[model samples]
Target chain A: GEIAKALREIAKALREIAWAHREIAKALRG
Target chain B: GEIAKALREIAKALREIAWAHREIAKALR
Candidate 1:
């Protein structure tokens, strides 16, 4: 499950990125 | 092409994310 573990981290980062993107856009628009 | 523009931004962000991820892993290691 080594690859799976790495992928899990990738997925988590992507989720965080999604949220960050939204906040960034929001902040930019303000 | 509004959606295309958004996707372009997404792609750019993903590329930046890739680089940031590499730096983060390097730092962690």
Candidate 2:
């Protein structure tokens, strides 16, 4: 269950990183 | 090699993502 939890957390964190990466691109536009 | 290939990509991307997270946190502070 811990491994499943870890992967779930990893996926969630990466999705947000992808969002953060998106903002970096947007921030660059200004 | 696909699982190997997949993990290679996964580890690499995750590594970079972690680094990017550090930088973003740094930028925010």
Candidate 3:
């Protein structure tokens, strides 16, 4: 349970970073 | 949760990564 909760939070945060990375890559490529 | 512990590490890493991205973007633009 603890892991899942933490995982959820971290996962959520990671998603934002991953999303940011995509945008970063897009801008860099362009 | 040890899970949260690692997650935080990863999360912080990404935040730094994201922060670096902003810097890179600034230089690039």
Candidate 4:
């Protein structure tokens, strides 16, 4: 359960980073 | 120059991500 919970948190963090990367990429294109 | 700056940041963030991934992967094993 501990590992699962940590993985979920890591996934959440990565998702946020993914969105941030998209935003940065979009800005670079403009 | 703008492109270069952006690339630097991207690289930096990616390096961080790579390290974090390794840390997580190590824990999973």
Best by lDDT: 3
How well does candidate 1 reproduce the true complex, by DockQ?
0.05
Highest DockQ: give the candidate number: 3
Per-residue error at B11 for model 4, in Å? Answer: 19
Give me the candidate number with maximum TM-score: 3
Q: TM-score ranking from best to worst?
A: 3, 4, 2, 1
lDDT of 2 at B10: 51
Q: Give the clashing residue pairs of candidate 2, or none.
A: none
lDDT values, one for every candidate: 0.59, 0.62, 0.72, 0.58
Worst 10 residues of 2 chain A by lDDT: A1-10
TM-score of chain B of 4: 0.73
For model 3, what fraction of the real interface contacts is kept?
A: 0.47
Candidate 3, residues A1-30, lDDT tens digits: the string is 766776676677777777767777888799
For model 2 the TM-score comes to: 0.47
For candidate 2, lDDT tens digit of each residue in B1-29?
A: 43455445556667767666666676666
Q: What digit string (tens of lDDT, one per residue) describes model 1 on residues B3-23?
A: 555555565666678667555
Candidates 2 and 3: which is better by TM-score?
3
Which model is ahead, 1 or 2, in terms of DockQ?
2
Candidate 4 interface RMSD, angstroms, 1 decimal: 16.9
**Candidate 4: which pairs clash?**
none
Better of 3 and 4 by lDDT: 3
Tens digit of per-residue lDDT, candidate 3, span B1-29: 66668877876777777777667766666
Candidate 1 lDDT by residue in tens digits, A1-30: 544554555566577666656655555566
Worst 10 residues of 3 chain A by lDDT: A2-11
